[PDB]
């Protein structure tokens, strides 16, 4: 099961294991979209993609025209939020069945996990589930894979360290959501958009402060600017609880300081009662990525700062729940 803690390799799967006749159904839990992933895939493959948002009759017309063009030209088609037209989804499945497309043609159907999606369409295509990464290590891996390598490796050598700190903060915040009453007060929508806004803010302020210099002093980094912008606009925008805002401020002040550049900086304290997470000493992207891949498989809510027993009852439920699935499919 190791392959499944790695980020999804859409490039190879789409290029090889998916027939042109088979649509790529891309089901996501609420709070996640897969449009960005395949848009990036089309960008890096230099493949033209026509994206259509379902919801209008002229939307259906534009769809049908786009599929009709792409099955001959070999281009790519995206239809987003297709779960809002189940009958049209059935018609699309029927149209797709009797079709002989170009070898390079690809159809992507972006939807959320909804019980109204027709069964026959699901059997027709290949399903990919997009959901929160299972662990902190997985979330760091996904974050580092999403961000282009050239974006991290810019002129300031501290940009990679800032990006690693941002990825760790995003992973901690997003993994605290699995524990709804304790990790936060409610299911906040901390998603990819917040991460992208944070990365853009970091780039903008680092460029403003460091005028192309190869290196900058750790204290010269505008820590206050980043801290305030995350706490107020980027990640604090969705926060409507005073104590949730206090916790976010606590995390930001614990992470985004100059002490994070120390060799002895502690990301987490006493995760297993004795050992604690140690901040990497690297200065480049590859060192941080290697450190992430070297993380222990064992993960506990003490990584998040939560008490270790906070995951007990939930796990118990899943355990019992697992049995229920096995005893239902014998």
């Amino acid at each position: 099961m190791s392959i499944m803690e790695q980020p999804l390799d859409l490039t190879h799967i789409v290029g090889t294991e998916v027939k042109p006749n088979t649509p790529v159904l891309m089901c996501s839990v609420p709070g996640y979209d897969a449009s960005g992933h395949v848009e990036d895939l089309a960008a890096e493959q230099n493949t033209q993609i026509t994206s259509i948002a379902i919801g209008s009759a002229e939307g259906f017309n534009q769809a049908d025209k786009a599929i009709n063009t792409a099955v001959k030209s070999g281009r790519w088609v995206m239809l987003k939020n297709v779960h809002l037209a189940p009958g049209w989804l059935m018609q699309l499945e029927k149209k797709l069945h009797s079709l002989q497309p170009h070898a390079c043609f690809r159809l992507f159907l972006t939807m959320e996990i909804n019980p109204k999606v027709p069964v026959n369409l699901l059997r027709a295509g290949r399903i990919f589930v997009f959901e929160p990464p299972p662990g902190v290590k997985a979330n760091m891996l996904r974050t580092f894979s999403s961000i282009p390598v050239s974006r991290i490796c810019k002129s300031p050598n501290e940009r990679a360290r800032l990006y690693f700190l941002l990825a760790w903060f995003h992973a901690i915040i997003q993994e605290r959501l699995r524990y709804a009453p304790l990790g936060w007060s409610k299911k906040y929508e901390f998603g990819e958009s917040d991460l992208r806004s944070a990365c853009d803010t970091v780039d903008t302020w680092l460029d403003d402060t460091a005028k192309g210099r190869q290196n900058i002093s750790p204290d010269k980094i505008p820590w206050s600017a980043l801290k305030t912008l995350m706490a107020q606009s980027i990640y604090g925008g969705r926060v409507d609880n005073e104590f949730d805002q206090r916790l976010l401020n606590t995390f930001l002040e614990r992470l985004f300081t100059t002490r994070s550049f120390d060799s002895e900086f502690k990301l987490a304290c006493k995760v297993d009662g004795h050992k604690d997470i140690q901040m990497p000493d690297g200065i480049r992207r590859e060192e941080f990525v290697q450190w992430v891949e070297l993380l222990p498989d064992t993960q506990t809510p003490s990584w998040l700062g939560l008490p270790n027993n906070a995951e007990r009852v939930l796990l118990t439920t899943q355990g019992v729940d697992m049995i229920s699935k096995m005893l239902k499919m014998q």
Partner: protein, 290 residues
């Protein structure tokens, strides 16, 4: 069938089976989604042409008199009232209904009007398919040998049946006594000698079947595991509505693990290749499904 058949085949094999059976009678394939369905239906009714109609979940109620055989006989003509016009119903007409959704619901009247024919995938059939696929992939010579000998046994058994029937017919058509006409003796001797030759051919084909099956026995556990994996995939739908997998999905998994396996580049041992194939089957099945 008495009531006109309604075929449920997600794989569609029944569909071209029906086309091949009625190809010589000029069967026409159409759909309820086609706006010209009335024209094709009335042409088939008038000229007695076999018809196959897909997408039965969009059933057109205009077929109710046809399915109920609400025919009226007058002046030697069998009139059927299609909508508002009368058509002389040719006795050679026949209609088949098909769908690719095994989970589609039907109104009780339509269920009453048709004979349901479900083409489900059984464990034995899937085991046989997987065993044939692995035999073709790993031992193509054995695969073609088996195919040729199945053809040979089919031909030989047909020949034996024909010879037996002709012998009975000859002994039954004699106008008198056997020895009165020598041609009867000639025919009987010819039939008996042909029967002996076909019997010895059957025996040799049977022993080569013996060796073919005794070399095919090695791959049987893989086929059993394949059938079990596919049926676990099918049972996966009980735990979440999104877990809908088709037979083509598992067959693609099997094709990938057989032909597109990176672990079979330099391995030539049959036992080693079989073990690698099984392990990678489990791994690839889990990866793709999960």
């Amino acid at each position: 069938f008495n009531r006109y058949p309604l075929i449920i085949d997600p794989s569609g094999q029944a569909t071209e089976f029906i086309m091949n059976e009625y190809k010589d009678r000029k069967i026409t394939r159409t759909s309820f989604l086609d706006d010209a369905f009335r024209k094709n239906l009335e042409s088939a009714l008038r000229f007695g042409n076999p018809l196959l109609v897909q997408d039965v979940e969009s059933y057109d109620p205009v077929l109710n008199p046809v399915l109920n055989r609400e025919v009226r006989r007058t002046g030697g003509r069998v009139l059927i009232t299609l909508g508002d016009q009368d058509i002389d119903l040719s006795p050679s007409f026949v209609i088949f209904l098909s769908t690719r959704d095994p989970t589609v619901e039907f109104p009780p009247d339509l269920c009453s009007r048709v004979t349901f024919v479900n083409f489900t995938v059984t464990r034995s059939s899937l085991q046989s398919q997987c065993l044939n696929e692995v035999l073709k992939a790993e031992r193509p010579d054995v695969d073609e040998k088996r195919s040729d000998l199945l053809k040979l046994q089919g031909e030989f058994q047909l020949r034996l049946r024909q010879l037996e029937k002709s012998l009975l017919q000859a002994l039954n058509e004699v106008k008198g006594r056997i020895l009165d006409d020598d041609t009867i003796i000639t025919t009987l001797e010819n039939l008996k000698r042909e029967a002996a030759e076909v019997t010895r051919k059957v025996e040799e084909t049977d022993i080569v079947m013996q060796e073919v099956e005794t070399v095919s026995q090695q791959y049987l556990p893989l086929s059993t595991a394949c059938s079990s994996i596919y049926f676990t995939m099918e049972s996966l739908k009980q735990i979440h509505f999104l877990y809908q997998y088709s037979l083509q999905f598992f067959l693609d998994i099997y094709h990938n693990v057989l032909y597109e396996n990176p672990n079979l580049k330099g391995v030539t041992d049959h036992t080693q290749r079989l073990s690698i194939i099984t392990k990678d089957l489990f791994q690839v099945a889990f990866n793709r499904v999960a």
